């Protein structure tokens with residue numbers, strides 16, 4: 001029930017030069033806009049991007065995209081499935097740039113692929129202004145997995161873009177789901193830091209300005225790590241992160257009778273994640289082994305300290321205008337599924 005619109009600026013493209021785009025469901029009465037960034041890993045050289053083109057082509061091209069998509073989870077229009085923002089204008093932005101939403105480079109005689117993630121977001125925002133976004137009160141930039149990291153990389157740029165376009169009244173906020181990773185030691189010895197270092201050069205990747213100025217040339221990969229980029233951001237950002245995220249465990253070379261070394265490794269991972277969220281006032285971090293939450297149909301089921309994620313997001317909304325309406329919800333129990341509300345699989 002979200003309808004595809006390919007970008008009118010056809011110079012803003014997916015990896016293979018096909019036009020990027022977005023799926024839109026408008027809500028006539030609403031001044032709330034939800035723009036969701038899809039995830040799905042990334043690629044960082046010719047060889048691994050070629051492989052992704054063979055077997056994950058929808059993440060590199062719009063040529064085979066369907067005319068519509070069904071909104072699920074926070075993108076559902078039904079209050080039963082989406083207690084939070086069911087009546088909002090909803091936008092799903094397909095991830096077709098393979099660059100963690102950071103790229104600003106075109107396909108050309110020197111570049112086999114285009115990496116335009118950061119420009120896709122900017123162009124979607126610009127084209128939506130003529131479709132009602134100009135009347136918005138709140139724009140929530142949300143995303144899962146690589147899209148969650150994309151929120152952290154792009155939320156302040158969206159805020160700056162709207163300010164420079166003359167829309168200072170639109171309140172830009174971020175919701176980063178499953179995009180808060182640790183550059184930790186692997187359990188056995190890709191290492192995230194090196195691949196992102198390579199990707200930034202391959203993509204012409206861009207990072208938020210204040211973070212860029214802290215880490216400087218050659219070190220901008222640091223800004224892909226939530227606990228380092230988050231303190232530099234000005235827009236309000238709600239962080240959703242499983243304490244034992246499956247993608248984190250994968251990059252850590254953990255594949256699950258757990259003996260002492262792996263037990264301590266997993267417990268330390270949860271402790272470190274919890275530590276990085278200590279001073280993140282709006283966060284939801286259950287002690288579960290899983291990946292992504294906000295566009296899952298059963299996203300309402302998980303609770304931390306008896307509070308669901310849709311409730312926490314509602315409390316966040318109220319805090320940005322609380323007795324029994326918390327926004328900082330981080331599990332303290334130390335092993336996956338010590339929270340009984342964890343997804344079953």
Ligand SMILES: *[C@@H]1O[C@H](CO)[C@@H](O)[C@H](O)[C@H]1NC(C)=O
Pocket residue numbers: 009011012119123
């Ligand atoms: C199209 O997008 C490119 C890259 O973002 C930009 O340089 C150009 O000005 C845009 N043109 C139009 C007409 O939107």
